[PDB]
């Protein structure tokens, strides 16, 4: 159940832990992941994590395959101007797409249809083919510009899933909060997860 | 610097830790706090925390005074239908107002001008007097209904500050993430805080 | 085929027969039903029917189980402020939701995102998770306020299915008209029904 | 009291019983009725009723006069392109107009101002002269296209009265439900009726 | 001339004197008054006036009958959840409706179609039946939320009559200013009044 | 996979080759096709192709069955006013619908909800039941009227798929370009096709 | 605290007492007042008050200086076409501006940006420099034209403060009601006043 | 007749044949062409054609001059950041501008006024000087983002001419379809062409 292929895009918002954890969970569920990462997102990961991600796609692809324990060919890495990659065309095989985390800059580009890189093209392709598109914005405060861009995409079928974890399962660590958001993303995709239990499932009567 | 009085309202969104931590920081900065809490928010606090908050205003006021080490009269607690409380009238002394956390239900009420309790009246009063109003929504995903309500209030001068903590200062605990959001709220209010350093302050040239 | 679980909410519009008949059909199709009923809807049922529905959830749950011949645990009844019930959280297992009948007051609450009870929260949750939401309004005339609320929800993916039965299968009783509307609801949910035949199915050529 | 002349238009929505019953009630109240019926509505009446309505205006006029026990000249029947009929011009004597039932196609035509037949012209004339116009739509679900057309006309003064009968007077037959809707239409027109009692008229105090 | 029955609703805005004076004038003009009063409005009347209004409908009805010198059955009082009262249904006998004074909270409820009590239902019924609806808001400043709600209702046919008395007849007391507003309300209803003379009636030429 | 039944409508835009090729591909995938064709579309086919299509449904149905090598009953042809055909009612069995090619006139009718023929009714039914609806407009330039109609339908869930073939697979004939568009339509429907390969499927890394 | 200079404009709405009382309070707080008055406002003052205001600026300035006990140069009076006055240019020293009372005609001019006199220019200058602008409309009913103009200005930062006094401090005279509105204006400006006490200031707990 | 100078911009949409054929036709009509081509468009031309276009402007200019048989100086090639080129300034000599083909990314940039390269600046200049601007989008499906951008530009005077060739002149090759679109572009520019005959020119009477 859920999509066989997922386009996972990481952009330069804080919350690089969310994207890496999502990537790992997708691998453990035996999903094929088309991995995209912006230049600013590489800076964020170097600043916020101890993950030393190689810069070029192929070295990055080999590193990520090792980091998550993925099978050969399970993780595909595509550069930011590789228009020959599957996500660049609606004639490609159907993927679900997640931008996690999603910068306000990338949010604006997708909202206006700017196609300045492969992440922005892939999101444009997902909307025109009405394939799943999940944006995980991380920003505070949300300006009216941010909110109008989120509202326009939400009206068009995209899922605006902010990196705003809930506390209703007594989190004990940063990792508990990261897992909580990733579990919502997996729920939204229809992919099984055991980190976030189904609320009230054994609650029969008030 | 910053407001002498703050109306702190807590509603039934997850993230009760944010409101309690904000209340404590406000007390440490020697601010007078008009504390409001919804019935659903009391359920959330009992579920998510080990804080045993008394139910009625006066017992609640004595408890909170002890819990934060506040001076006598520094924390005022007002019931949900006490229209004689200062926040209910624009002729009151000027306060800043924070709803943290802010449920989508309370977000909707403030956006539409529904005045079904003192929290909703106080927010209506803040907007009509153009006094500061900060909403801290905690929800995921954000629906188009949520986004339209946030956008309308943002256009009217309210600050939409989601409970979406950043990771760019290497958080080591849940408490680090809670402090990060509370620090943004204090920054937005113009109240001093030392939990979140000023970004790039010693960065002279690229 | 169709949803395994359905949140059936009844609100204080005339047409209590529609909701009871839908509940019975859902039970006969071996579906799990999370049953919600407003205070005004209880008054409507007492006025319009000879069904003597018990007031509290558990007594109501036992009564409804007997009334429809349902298996144990097949019908769950949840009170109007039971936030621990599954419908209150998007982290719950996926349900389809039907408000039948839907008052103009509940229509307004769902349109604006007011979350004043569990019915209104559950509808808010369904929209944010993009799970099925069917509203069955019963009102005449429709004001512009009613129509704007229906249009906003329809634009957001909700199904506005008014209690306006068709006559194109020669109805002979009130029960025929009630069955006609319930069959449209079941069709909309993707649940099998034999009360409303498939139009023109054996019509080969003009 | 109420209008002396009524333009009654029937279009190809299910619910031909509503229009025939309304026509009969109007005759019993000694009102002059300008009767219009679309080609699709004639098909609906043949399918849904045992009324064998003649096809051409004059034969149709003689039949309807007999069917309702109307006086000579009380019922006028006008063909779909008879621009010499009173409803086609705002310089005519003032009528109230009812489209019952009203197809979504005719609803769309009136909303956009399309004047492709005499029914659509007459409705255009009623709106420009600000004479009463009641639309009785029968459709389920209501699409956003349907709802936008109803909302536009409602904003312009038309009454959107859906064929959604109430059950709060214990209906015992299809005829009770048909009478309920017709009574609302008569109430809206200001014409006396005894089928639907005045709600709460003898209810002095709670 | 003017309406035989008036639904007079009082809500929790300052200006309780306006509603009591209007009620008295309506009684002196031999009109039947369906009186509704919110819980907050009862607090306002106790604070702003020396009128000791009984709390429950029937005691309140007997008191008001004595206070205005009304005939038996001339004043009907209905509780806030009495859905059996005439104002709750459009099938009732036609009334005009006045909300005086009208809180911003009730203004918001009527604008959005929220039907949380009988006052809000009655206003919803008045708009859908296109029966007169006069709102008398008392608030300062008017926020953009207040203004959008007033504008939406004004566009829908409601009369937005603020408690903003004119001074162009040399008022000598608070009672002169209260009478001035009540006279505008009576003028708007088409009910005779002698408190506010017809402007320029004997002004023949400049 | 994909829909078992497809309503294929052809209207009077240039590009009759697209519709005939789509019809053939649907037959080869063993799908049941409900075929509708406008009067203007018949003129276009006679002008642009050597296909001699019979005028009346039944003769047309026999011809099309032979032309595509379809099984008996696989292709159903319905006249433009046959309201007894399945597409005319939402109570019919679920179909996907394609208008290929789609004139600007039919685009306008579907956008406004005009139901002047069975093609326009069927599209209205598809939108209200939220069943797939694909429009293949052929026009140049696109006016603002055309664009507003396409945008409104796109916002409502319809797929606006213009007859604008891509050249990125080195087309060698008109037939290659026709096949390219038909393949996008089949992709959009979820029906297998081998004319348009999946873009970048074997592209592992940049 | 508060602005050192205030542009006080009086226009031809009823409520000349409000403007004169505001002018006096501003003088008592030692503020410099740039006084503007329309031709219609002069007629209103002659009709509604016993103040005999001289017609030309300089005589008017000497009179007003005596009437309020102001220091020399404290009150400046500028004619309606004196473009050399400070309020006519954004390069002037910063003022706050109040139009009290504000006619619907002047409200319309400021909303649309009409600059037909110095009052309208000064308001245009205040909005473009984002300096305080308070409008005190006096009208009843408010039309939709009035409400749209107020809403547009409110959205742009202007304060719409209607002459709608509250009664929650037991007013005993017309002068009490005039003082109540003037006190709100002074509160809005941030200027000290003792006529309207701070609501609930000594209300510690419910 | 028609413009003496044309700014021909090619962007990275499929349909490079359209732009090359248009360029050739413009040369044959003795027009001066200011040629712009994006980096992505160069990739498209290498993929879709056997044209080996040199990368740098001057080598590209010499190649194109030879490829079309143009006179010296007839084709000017300008790099993507050459702000000294005529198209970058509205003070330049008047040109008509065509973007053929036009990517959805460039469509978005022109719609929002983004000026990230000379193609986008030139289009911004054309709109502000109200000089002709023709966009030739090639995409399928058109998303709502695409459609809103096209509609905004169409409303502003730009011609949205999709690469959607007609078939009503019996095309026999890909080249016939390419010529058909190019002929519409030339018609829109007012430049003579003989590839597309004038429809119905010798059709005297029906
Ligand atoms: C360490 C760090 C942290 C952040 C950022 C930067 C850096 C270096 N930036 C700014 C962001 O990277 C910038 O706007 C880029 O232009 C985003 O480009 P992409 O959208 O990734 O192409 C950023 N932007 C944002 O919208 N939300 C955020 O939380 C952050 N946080
Ligand atoms: C433990 C727990 C946790 C949550 C909630 C409930 C409970 C019991 N609720 C639902 C919320 O309380 C409900 O909509 C109330 O109606 C909110 O009422 P107030 O806005 O506080 O008056 C809730 N609502 C929301 O908008 N965001 C959230 O994160 C949560 N989380
Ligand atoms: C017998 C009877 C019948 C009706 C009602 C009431 C009663 C007692 N009410 C009014 C409705 O109950 C009221 O607006 C409630 O506030 C609705 O509350 P909920 O939406 O159920 O919480 C009602 N409301 C509505 O929108 N449509 C209807 O057909 C009816 N009919
Ligand atoms: C028996 C039967 C029943 C119905 C219909 C048809 C038939 C034959 N039609 C379809 C409708 O007649 C069609 O859209 C016509 O084009 C309407 O034309 P007029 O609006 O009457 O000119 C129809 N249309 C609609 O909007 N609501 C309905 O309930 C029905 N029901
Ligand atoms: C003495 C006093 C005076 C006022 C109020 C309160 C009290 C106690 N309230 C607040 C108002 O009562 C509150 O928003 C209630 O929620 C209104 O509820 P109803 O609309 O009456 O159901 C109030 N609200 C408002 O909109 N305008 C006003 O002038 C006042 N004045
Ligand atoms: C040969 C030929 C070619 C075309 C046309 C006509 C003919 C005869 N028409 C015009 C179209 O047929 C006309 O607007 C009809 O009214 C469309 O009616 P339907 O939408 O099919 O009912 C047409 N219309 C359009 O929108 N796009 C097109 O490409 C064409 N091409
Ligand atoms: C005694 C008296 C009283 C009033 C008025 C007039 C007079 C003579 N006028 C009408 C107003 O003066 C007129 O519309 C002028 O054109 C307003 O011009 P200024 O806006 O002052 O330039 C007026 N206008 C308004 O909007 N509200 C009001 O309350 C009054 N009252
Ligand atoms: C072979 C080939 C074919 C296409 C594309 C690419 C490639 C390599 N791209 C994607 C497009 O080039 C991308 O969005 C660029 O960012 C466009 O940049 P410019 O607008 O030319 O600056 C593309 N984009 C689009 O909107 N429509 C199309 O038909 C195509 N086709
Ligand atoms: C890279 C590429 C083939 C882009 C075009 O894809 P599509 O046909 O616009 O979905
Ligand atoms: C409780 C109270 C005095 C409410 C009225 O306040 P305001 O004058 O509307 O700001
Ligand atoms: C009762 C409860 C857990 C509400 C919060 O749910 P969600 O995470 O907002 O979908
Ligand atoms: C048939 C006729 C006279 C139509 C014109 O009427 P009107 O003057 O437009 O109201
Ligand atoms: C209390 C009651 C009968 C509510 C329903 O009234 P209506 O038919 O919706 O006008
Ligand atoms: C031909 C026909 C039954 C039309 C009515 O269908 P629906 O119930 O409006 O979906
Ligand atoms: C009277 C005058 C200088 C008007 C121009 O002022 P501004 O520079 O437009 O603020
Ligand atoms: C390169 C250049 C002169 C840009 C400015 O042109 P314009 O005056 O803005 O039309
Ligand atoms: Na770009
Ligand atoms: Na309320
Ligand atoms: Na609430
Ligand atoms: Na016509
Ligand atoms: Na309600
Ligand atoms: Na029609
Ligand atoms: Na002027
Ligand atoms: Na730029």
């Amino acid at each position: 159940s859920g999509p066989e292929r997922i386009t996972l895009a990481m952009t330069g918002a804080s919350g690089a832990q969310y994207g890496l954890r999502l990537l790992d969970c997708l691998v453990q569920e035996e999903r094929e992941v088309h991995f995209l990462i912006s230049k600013a997102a590489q800076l964020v990961m170097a600043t916020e994590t101890d993950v030393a991600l190689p810069a070029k796609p192929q070295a990055m692809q080999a590193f990520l395959t090792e980091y998550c324990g993925a099978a050969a060919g399970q993780i595909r890495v595509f550069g930011q101007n590789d228009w020959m990659a599957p996500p660049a065309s609606g004639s490609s095989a159907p993927n679900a797409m997640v931008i996690c985390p999603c910068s306000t800059g990338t949010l604006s580009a997708v909202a206006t249809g700017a196609c300045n890189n492969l992440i922005e093209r892939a999101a444009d392709v997902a909307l025109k083919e009405r394939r799943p598109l999940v944006l995980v914005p991380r920003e505070a405060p949300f300006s009216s510009i941010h909110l109008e861009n989120m509202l326009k995409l939400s009206n068009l079928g995209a899922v605006i899933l902010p990196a705003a974890p809930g506390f209703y399962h007594q989190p004990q660590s940063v990792e508990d909060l990261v897992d909580q958001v990733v579990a919502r993303i997996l729920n939204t995709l229809g992919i099984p997860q055991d980190m976030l239990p189904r609320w009230g499932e054994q609650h029969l009567v008030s």
Side-chain angles (χ1 to χ4, degrees), chain A residues 1-38 40-197 199-206:
Chain A
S1 290
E4 192 181 12
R5 295 164 298 280
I6 297 93
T7 301
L8 175 56
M10 298 188 58
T11 62
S14 175
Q17 264 194 69
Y18 295 114
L20 288 166
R21 180 55 167 163
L22 173 57
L23 173 65
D24 183 63
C25 287
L26 291 178
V27 170
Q28 301 329 298
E29 293 303 306
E30 300 177 81
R31 311 305 166 122
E32 181 174 317
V33 177
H34 296 193
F35 187 80
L36 318 169
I37 185 163
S38 76
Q42 301 186 253
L43 300 163
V44 173
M45 187 174 290
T47 307
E48 295 189 350
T49 76
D50 293 317
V51 183
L53 195 72
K56 302 282 66 164
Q58 315 184 330
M60 189 188 290
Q61 175 179 274
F63 177 97
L64 289 167
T65 300
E66 272 326 91
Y67 167 97
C68 322
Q74 184 175 17
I75 304 178
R76 305 209 215 175
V77 172
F78 299 115
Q80 281 310 297
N81 293 276
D82 184 7
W83 310 119
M84 316 309 291
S89 176
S91 63
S92 65
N95 294 8
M97 185 170 179
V98 183
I99 305 185
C100 172
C102 183
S103 70
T104 66
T106 287
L107 162 72
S108 162
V110 179
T112 68
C115 290
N116 285 319
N117 56 53
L118 180 56
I119 295 166
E120 298 173 5
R121 174 60 178 174
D124 196 64
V125 164
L127 290 162
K128 85 188 177 75
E129 307 295 342
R130 297 187 189 273
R131 290 163 188 181
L133 176 61
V134 186
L135 269 51
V136 185
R138 211 301 313 173
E139 183 55 275
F142 284 157
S143 88
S144 288
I145 294 175
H146 306 157
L147 292 167
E148 173 177 350
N149 290 334
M150 291 182 239
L151 175 60
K152 177 174 170 192
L153 291 170
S154 193
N155 282 345
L156 291 187
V159 182
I160 305 303
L161 204 165
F167 286 69
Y168 49 86
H169 287 309
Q170 293 223 300
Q172 297 300 314
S173 66
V174 178
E175 289 69 23
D176 284 358
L177 294 178
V178 170
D179 288 354
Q180 222 257 336
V181 173
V182 173
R184 317 270 324 186
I185 300 171
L186 293 178
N187 283 350
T188 295
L189 295 176
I191 295 172
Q193 55 83 21
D194 54 16
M195 303 169 283
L196 178 46
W199 182 259
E201 205 182 8
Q202 330 305 340
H203 188 92
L204 215 41
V205 68
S206 320

